[PDB]
Design a protein around this ligand. Structure first.
Ligand code: HEC
Ligand code: HEC
Ligand code: HEC
Ligand code: HEC
Ligand code: HEC
Ligand code: HEC
Ligand code: HEC
Ligand code: HEC
Ligand code: HEC
Ligand code: HEC
Ligand code: CA
Ligand code: CA
Lengths: 473, 473
């Protein structure tokens, strides 16, 4: 066994090669401000946290700190304030399964994100994927098995080794929602938990289908919405990195090539063979071990073939979100023009469904390569749903005496956030205050109670490197 | 050499195995009436021959007879009548390169289809793909090299052996248009030819791109249109089986897997290994021969994987053509309501472009599998172009006093053909009359002049087998 299991440093003496390679994800220190790259996204997520801050993923090394640095988590004053719940910690630290094991799952999912600010202090580590006694692959978060069984699939424990080499990634790289769960503790006090739940009841990655249509069917049946759009007033569904669901629909997934085969290639230093734990941000940069063992041709040729896929996805991504953004703005105009909720009934259903399809397609960044067919198909479907809604809107507008309406420009993050009612300067000030106050208090208490050793990872908070999405001071 | 090489039966004595397997395409005797299956196609091609008769492909054995049987070729009464030109024989017979070599290319392309009715009497044969003296692969139709060179690709003769195994198919399975060409013969007479031309000036199959965008650029630049849509009055572009262009864009094409690898798989009879000349209508039905030499997988699983691709394509196909169909009808309503050509300029450009993208995606039946990515992307693009045009149309219609217009239904061949101004009962009557008179007179002369031996292929005309698209009783 390993004492202080959540502290990956502790494993280093037993497994130096895995520890050293694991820490190398520190090298993946760059992310792209997606709201600045594709401002239409701000309009799509208007009224939601994602319209504030949303960057591409970077090294696992920065997972915990980026979750803290993001405008999405806001600026809490204490453990009872802040916009987001405890569930936001779930896929960022080994301290998560620890707390679930100690205090219970429901208790872990009860309260504000700030509640565990001092408890959840170690980044995605060894304990998130391995047993401390045997080092065998292991998943300690109960949401995964719950989703697998809902999808009619085997639990992690009933799966094969190759299945697990993928499932230890799926414990986080999946689509989910927060299920409001009412419960009662030991003392008999009624509480409310927001439980990470995978909407897999209708299956995922089944015969080439990512599972999006089934998810929509499920979400509508339980009448769930992540938020109400602040422009169109549409009950919306947010998609989040459905890496596993899409991977399962793609050819590699259908052929049994695990995430680990491409992202954690086997390697050999001297006479010792081991798995490279620097989860590769871009396997195309390590083609020799990530691909060429199964593919026989030039690396430049294969990298070129993959780039064509990125171009195709980008082409449909732009079309879909431009249509979706206009659909929201035009719905806002219709409301202003006097259109009733009943009149907007069908329009809203199509915007909800369409954006979810399009969002799911782009929410897992590797989708364009892992699952090009479902990705292109869903961007096509989401775009069409939006266009279908826009055709109804032109008629509704005309009926209300509005002709030739043209939605405003949302071609820059600034213009879009203005339309979304987001004051980034204010949020940045409030967020910077938090980081200089409460956050440092968290790291102070954590070090004092031996919960973490932040001195070993000082280069983790890069908020001031001049590459921040919101801290442009 | 081989005298009367246009008569494939003359090659039997030298290459019996290739001849007997070539004849077995006779077994692929079924086609699907695509206008009955997807009546939206009738609206799409309204004002053009394809709105009358369009079936899926069937055995090479039936190519010439199906060309003669189609309502598209009409009912000529003599050598100077009939709706179509000589170019329609071009990819149906070995007598084609014979006529080009004897009479010259421009002369072969000058005149009505009926002009060569008693000369083009042998179906796709050995001579279409082989030199009669050496049996080496050979292409004798100049349009291919002309297209290849236009696309910056090597000529057939300069291509590799593996390239040639694809090019002997590309001589016919490609997109083309008729180029009105003014010329003067040896005796000083001025003539006009309609030359088969591949619109490849902007390249085809380049880095994952089928080449549709470049073709639109080309066609627009030369102000060419295949026909003026009779409902929307849009100058339209018709796509025709761009098998090679799409194949080149897919993974198999990019990896050098030729059409012949899957469609003319090697076979072993006793100690003789040769190419199976029964060009496989559905290679999935001969997986062991057509795929397992490169893939190690269960037949049901591989077939299931490919079927997924068909479902994805069918999903986007229906969406694109329903939007395109409604766009044409709504444009027709706009014309009736009083919209000018100036008011409809952008609407028509979008319809022309959108339909061409969608049509190219579905025009080569195997595209869904050969090139799933470009197929899905182009159907998405085509559908979007149609939706953009429809958004403009609601506004145009409203400005002309038309509110909430609902296009008529086109869910059955009968309904759509009526909207298309196609009197199939009448067309069928005159076609049958042509078949019973002139066609038979063509057959008589052919046998008498020793140009063909029709008795050897008595089962080729299946117009009365009960599965004709138009000959219904
Ligand atoms: C509560 C609603 C959450 C907040 C706030 C954040 N997450 Fe996550 N998260 C997960 C993965 C697999 C990734 C990487 C893949 C990807 O980003 O597409 C992320 C990444 C982040 C990031 C960095 C990127 C960004 O700027 O958006 C932030 C700031 C972040 N997450 C905040 C996985 C999970 C997960 C597992 C099931 C859950 C429940 C959440 N994340 C919840 C939140
Ligand atoms: C989950 C996302 C992981 C994290 C974080 C870490 N490891 Fe890991 N490890 C993971 C996989 C998918 C694999 C391959 C399993 C296989 O046998 O194919 C590994 C493997 C190991 C092993 C076994 C030997 C080897 O292949 O290298 C060890 C000793 C091991 N991992 C240790 C280890 C340590 C110490 C970590 C923290 C620094 C760590 N792993 C994180 C998945 C994941
Ligand atoms: C090889 C066949 C792979 C398999 C199996 C999986 N991934 Fe992958 N992944 C691969 C590539 C070539 C790429 C594209 C890289 C690029 O920069 O273009 C990806 C990308 C990702 C990403 C996005 C990383 C980022 O944007 O920073 C993630 C999050 C990712 N992959 C996750 C992942 C998971 C969880 C997998 C199994 C379910 C998986 N990948 C499989 C190649 C391969
Ligand atoms: C939850 C605890 C996770 C597990 C287990 C795995 N990933 Fe992950 N991943 C997660 C987050 C929160 C992030 C973003 C971190 C940030 O600061 O932005 C990521 C990121 C990636 C990336 C890109 C960066 C990198 O380290 O290469 C990839 C390619 C990726 N994740 C792949 C991946 C695979 C293949 C996994 C299993 C072996 C895996 N991740 C597990 C959260 C979690
Ligand atoms: C073996 C374990 C593999 C590894 C690692 C990678 N790929 Fe792969 N790939 C594999 C299979 C079995 C297949 C299916 C075809 C078959 O032989 O049955 C594929 C297919 C591809 C494709 C074609 C599909 C497409 O989207 O166009 C591509 C372009 C491809 N693979 C790329 C690729 C890359 C870039 C990899 C490394 C990051 C990679 N593969 C790894 C098996 C394996
Ligand atoms: C080669 C460059 C061609 C020219 C010129 C024309 N056709 Fe063709 N035709 C060609 C192929 C490769 C195929 C099979 C693939 C497919 O998608 O159909 C065909 C098929 C036909 C058919 C049968 C199917 C059908 O449409 O009902 C007919 C009746 C046919 N072709 C007629 C036809 C006419 C009338 C032509 C002049 C406009 C013509 N073809 C030209 C290849 C080529
Ligand atoms: C083009 C559409 C073809 C038609 C019509 C016929 N043949 Fe063919 N043949 C074709 C290809 C692509 C190949 C393979 C060439 C290679 O080298 O890989 C062949 C091959 C032959 C051969 C060589 C031996 C063999 O591989 O079987 C012979 C002797 C041959 N073909 C004869 C032949 C005859 C007699 C045909 C008419 C009945 C005939 N072929 C038609 C392409 C085409
Ligand atoms: C294997 C990798 C193939 C290659 C290379 C090419 N084709 Fe193909 N083709 C293949 C399959 C599996 C299918 C689908 C069959 C089905 O019934 O779904 C096809 C289909 C065609 C078709 C359509 C046939 C019909 O509908 O009757 C045609 C006309 C066709 N293929 C032509 C063709 C050409 C000319 C190719 C090279 C340019 C080519 N195929 C390559 C598998 C393979
Ligand atoms: C023109 C002279 C052609 C050449 C050379 C090749 N094909 Fe063809 N193909 C052509 C026609 C006009 C038709 C339709 C015939 C009808 O009566 O409907 C076809 C059809 C096919 C099919 C389906 C039927 C079959 O025999 O399998 C396929 C799969 C197909 N063609 C593939 C193909 C390949 C791979 C070729 C090169 C070896 C090839 N065709 C050459 C016209 C012509
Ligand atoms: C060897 C000459 C091949 C033949 C015959 C067929 N396939 Fe193939 N296939 C081959 C390669 C080189 C690749 C690309 C991946 C790589 O190893 O580099 C592929 C890829 C596929 C795929 C994946 C792409 C996709 O659309 O999902 C599938 C599903 C596939 N091949 C199917 C397939 C079938 C059904 C075949 C016979 C009709 C077939 N291939 C023949 C090489 C070869
Ligand atoms: Ca979600
Ligand atoms: Ca054409």
């Amino acid at each position: 066994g390993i004492a202080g299991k959540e502290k990956s440093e502790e494993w280093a003496k037993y497994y130096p090669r895995q520890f050293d390679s694991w820490k190398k994800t520190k090298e993946y220190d760059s992310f792209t401000d997606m709201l600045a790259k594709d401002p239409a996204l701000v309009i799509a997520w208007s009224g939601y946290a994602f319209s504030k801050d949303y960057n591409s993923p970077r090294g696992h090394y920065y997972a915990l700190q980026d979750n803290v640095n993001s405008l999405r988590t806001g600026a809490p004053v204490d453990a009872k304030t802040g916009p987001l719940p405890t569930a936001c910690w779930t896929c960022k630290s080994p301290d998560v399964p620890r707390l679930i094991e100690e205090d219970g799952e429901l208790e872990y999912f009860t309260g504000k994100w700030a509640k565990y600010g001092s408890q959840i202090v170690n980044v995605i580590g060894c304990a998130n994927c391995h047993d401390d006694k045997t080092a065998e692959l292991k998943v300690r978060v109960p949401h995964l098995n719950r989703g697998l069984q809902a999808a009619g699939l085997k639990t992690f424990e009933e799966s094969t080794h190759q299945d697990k080499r993928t499932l230890v990634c799926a414990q986080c790289h999946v689509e989910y929602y927060f299920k409001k769960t009412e419960w009662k503790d030991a003392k008999g006090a009624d509480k409310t938990a927001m439980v990470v739940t995978l909407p897999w009841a209708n299956g995922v990655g089944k015969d080439g289908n990512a599972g999006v249509e089934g998810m929509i069917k499920y979400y509508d049946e339980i009448n769930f919405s992540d938020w109400t759009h602040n422009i169109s007033k549409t009950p919306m569904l947010k998609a989040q990195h459905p890496g596993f669901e899409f991977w399962k629909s793609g050819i590699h997934g259908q052929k049994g090539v695990s995430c680990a085969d491409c992202h954690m290639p086997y390697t050999q230093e001297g006479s010792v063979k081991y798995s490279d734990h620097q989860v590769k941000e871009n396997p195309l940069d390590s083609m020799d071990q990530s691909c060429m063992n199964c593919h026989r041709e030039s690396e430049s040729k294969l990298r070129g073939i993959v780039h064509q896929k990125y171009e195709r996805k980008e082409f449909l991504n732009k079309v879909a979100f431009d249509n979706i953004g206009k659909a929201h703005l035009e719905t806002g105009k219709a409301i202003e023009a006097g259109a009733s909720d009943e009149e907007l009934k069908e329009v809203r259903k199509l915007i909800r469904h369409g954006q979810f399809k399009a969002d799911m397609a782009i929410a897992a960044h590797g989708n364009y390569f892992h699952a090009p067919e479902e990705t292109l198909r869903l961007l096509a479907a989401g775009s069409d749903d939006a266009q279908k809604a826009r055709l109804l809107l032109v008629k509704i507008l005309a009926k209300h005496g509005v002709m030739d309406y043209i939605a405003p420009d949302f071609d820059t993050k600034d213009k879009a956030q203005k339309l979304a009612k987001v004051d980034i300067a204010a949020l940045a000030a409030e967020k910077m205050k938090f980081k200089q106050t409460l956050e440092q208090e968290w790291k102070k208490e954590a070090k004092a109670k031996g919960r973490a050793n932040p001195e070993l990872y000082k280069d983790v908070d890069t908020i001031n490197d001049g590459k921040s999405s919101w801290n442009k001071k």
